[PDB]
């Protein structure tokens, strides 16, 4: 929602099918003393947080929402037809809606979740592209941003570029690029620090069978059938697409409101969150319910009229986060320092070591020549490497910095952490 003349948003667009992205800061442990700090040297070493266990609270009453589009390319029912269809007019689009595939997932790690989608690249140049050609396809990884859309079962791609009609799908997805996680490339990471853990459940089934209506891109070669006549003189459009249909939802398949416990993950990180930083990304279809209310512009007249009532739509959203954490130290040697500095050197900035110490070791390869000039050859003066790199990438934010407490007992979640390990006397 935005002011009509302005570009400024009046109301933010939100629905369940938007992905969620949570970024969570932690205060530096090493700024942060202890009741008894004697057990380590803070000089020769450091302190770094670790994430043992995680919860996701969700409080709404469970129910399914939905979407549609007023204009949709459609021919007619393909399921049962007494007689052959009618002649194709101009713009037979109709108002029809459908339910999206029910889905649940969870994502955790220190590096942003990596996405992928279909999309258009540049055709190799032999044939000059004429309007109406089939644009070639390309597989593209990208960082995942908030507000992005789950698949509905139409697959990750850019409708905006690849779909000109702009009417071929219901609204919510028409604008953006629905995206989907690739477990492979992610888990293929050498450090695994993208994500160390995850869970997913989803299901779908067919409901209806329809036809696109539009200019035929290609006709099947005849030999795959036999010529018609009369009503069969002409071939109806070849296209079809299913209508995805959500199923019965249960309280059981809910993956939330229940604790988790991590020890070993497919990645070599064990719950280490570098740079005091941690990521969670979660998406649910189950709360999608859309309440609808009506306002009366005139309260007097006693005869019902469709004139008196405007209609609006707002959607509920409820999250909670509770994170266990563990505390850890690091010894320093060369091998250590080396091995880290390889992995991500930016990490070492926010610490001291004590710092001068690895401010680059590498002698240059000797690119050299004039140190002045306005006259002789071109030279470089670009360099800066963008120290808050991902600030380009917007997404939802929460600060915890202030909230830590030192006693599990006082919280609902924690005492379970005790119970799992027992030990009824709090250390």
């Amino acid at each position, epitope marked *: 929602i935005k002011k009509p003349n302005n570009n400024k948003i009046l109301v933010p667009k939100v629905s369940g099918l938007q992905y969620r992205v949570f970024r969570i800061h932690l205060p530096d442990p090493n700024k942060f003393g202890f009741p008894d700090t004697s057990f380590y040297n803070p000089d020769t070493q450091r302190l770094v947080w670790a994430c043992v266990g995680v919860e996701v609270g969700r409080g709404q009453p469970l129910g399914v929402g939905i979407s549609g589009h007023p204009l949709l390319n459609k021919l007619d029912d393909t399921e049962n037809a007494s007689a052959y269809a009618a*002649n194709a007019g101009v713009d037979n689009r109709e108002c029809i809606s459908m339910d999206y595939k029910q889905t649940q997932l969870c994502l955790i790690g220190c590096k942003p979740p990596i996405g992928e989608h279909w999309g258009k690249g540049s055709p190799c140049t032999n044939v000059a592209v*004429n309007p*109406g050609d089939c644009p070639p396809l390309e597989l593209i990884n990208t960082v995942i941003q908030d507000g992005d859309m789950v698949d509905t079962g139409f697959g990750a791609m850019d409708f905006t570029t690849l779909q000109a009609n702009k009417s071929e799908v219901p609204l919510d997805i028409c604008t953006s690029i629905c995206k989907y996680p690739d477990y492979i490339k992610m888990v293929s990471e050498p450090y695994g620090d993208s994500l160390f853990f995850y869970l997913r459940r989803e299901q779908m089934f067919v409901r209806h069978l329809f036809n696109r209506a539009g200019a035929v891109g290609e006709n099947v070669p005849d030999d795959l059938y036999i010529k018609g*006549s*009369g*009503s069969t003189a002409n071939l109806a459009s070849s296209n079809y697409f299913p209508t995805p249909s959500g199923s019965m939802v249960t309280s059981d398949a809910q993956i939330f409101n229940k604790p988790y416990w991590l020890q070993r993950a497919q990645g070599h990180n064990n719950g280490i969150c570098w740079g005091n930083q941690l990521f969670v990304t979660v998406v649910d279809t189950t709360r999608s319910t859309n309440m609808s209310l009506c306002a009366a512009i005139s309260t007097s007249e006693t005869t019902y009229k469709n004139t008196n009532f405007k209609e609006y739509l707002r959607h509920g959203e409820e999250y909670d986060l509770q994170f266990i954490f563990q505390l850890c130290k690091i010894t320093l040697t060369a091998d250590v320092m080396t091995y880290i500095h390889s992995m991500n050197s930016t990490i070492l900035e926010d610490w001291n070591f004590g710092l001068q110490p690895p401010p680059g070791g590498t002698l240059e390869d000797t690119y050299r020549f004039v140190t002045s000039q306005a006259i002789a050859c071109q030279k470089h003066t670009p360099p800066a490497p963008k120290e808050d790199p991902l600030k380009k990438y917007t997404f939802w934010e929460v600060n915890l910095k202030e909230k830590f407490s030192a006693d599990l007992d006082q919280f609902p979640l924690g005492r379970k952490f005790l119970l799992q390990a027992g030990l009824k006397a709090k250390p």
Partner: antibody, heavy 122, light 114 residues
Framework: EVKLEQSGAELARPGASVKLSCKASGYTFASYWMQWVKQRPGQGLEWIGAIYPGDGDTWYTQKFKGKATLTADKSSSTAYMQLSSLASEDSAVYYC???????????????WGQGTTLTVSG | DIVMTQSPSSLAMSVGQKVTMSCKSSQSLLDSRNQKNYLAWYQQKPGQSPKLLVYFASTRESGVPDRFIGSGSGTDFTLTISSVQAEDLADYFCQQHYSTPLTFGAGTKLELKR
């Protein structure tokens, strides 16, 4: 709006090759089937075949199987008819237009082109 | 591969008279589901460009007074013509939209008067 340029006239030698053109206005040139119709006095209307510029798929009636050939280019937005190895009775009017096929319709015709006449041999 | 028969060859006539040419062909232009008739009608005055008159059977094309009204049913058909003026003289054609390839009528040449 609806317009076709059916242009030229020609006289040529036996066994030679010929060329024809029909051009588009007020629609998408490549989005439908197209026609070529031979007009010979005393016989007249005859349906050669049809071509759909989208891929340029073809239809060749038993008569014109072989010798007749059809292609077009949409950047030109102009029809072509390529015929070779001429003959005397080939002399006639080739008078063609575009039926609506799609267009919320089927066969027969909404239109007739300009007309063009070919004479062989010289 | 079917064949159309277009008759009569020529008819002289006078103003306002009601004249009917005949349409004849082998198979049925017509079966009943959509009750489609594949007959066509074309007017060509000599030397100029032909044009569409009537398709199906009961079609009335935009720009045609009732001086032309379709007729014929079943297989072989006719054209009813109500009242003829001088401009109505022309060379008619009736042909077929069905079962590729296409098939045409022989020809229809109206003869004038006196």
């Amino acid at each position: 709006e609806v317009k076709l340029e059916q242009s030229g006239a020609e006289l040529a030698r036996p066994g030679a090759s010929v060329k024809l053109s029909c051009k588009a206005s007020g629609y998408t040139f490549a989005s439908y089937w197209m026609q070529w119709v031979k007009q010979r006095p005393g016989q007249g209307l005859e349906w050669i075949g049809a071509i759909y510029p989208g891929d340029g798929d073809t239809w060749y009636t038993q008569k014109f199987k072989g010798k007749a050939t059809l292609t077009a280019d949409k950047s030109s937005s102009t029809a072509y008819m390529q015929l070779s190895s001429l003959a005397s009775e080939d002399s006639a009017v080739y008078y063609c237009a575009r039926p609506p096929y799609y267009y919320g319709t089927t066969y027969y015709f909404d239109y007739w082109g300009q007309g063009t006449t070919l004479t062989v041999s010289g | 591969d079917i064949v159309m028969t277009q008759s009569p060859s020529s008819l002289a006539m006078s103003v306002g008279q009601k004249v009917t040419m005949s349409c004849k062909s082998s198979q049925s232009l017509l079966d009943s589901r959509n009750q489609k008739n594949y007959l066509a009608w074309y007017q060509q005055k000599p030397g100029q460009s032909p044009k569409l008159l009537v398709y199906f059977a009961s079609t009335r094309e935009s720009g045609v007074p009732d001086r032309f009204i379709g007729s014929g049913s079943g297989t072989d058909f006719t054209l009813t013509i109500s009242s003829v003026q001088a401009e109505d003289l022309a060379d008619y054609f009736c042909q077929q939209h069905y079962s590729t390839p296409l098939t045409f009528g022989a020809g229809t040449k109206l003869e004038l008067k006196r």
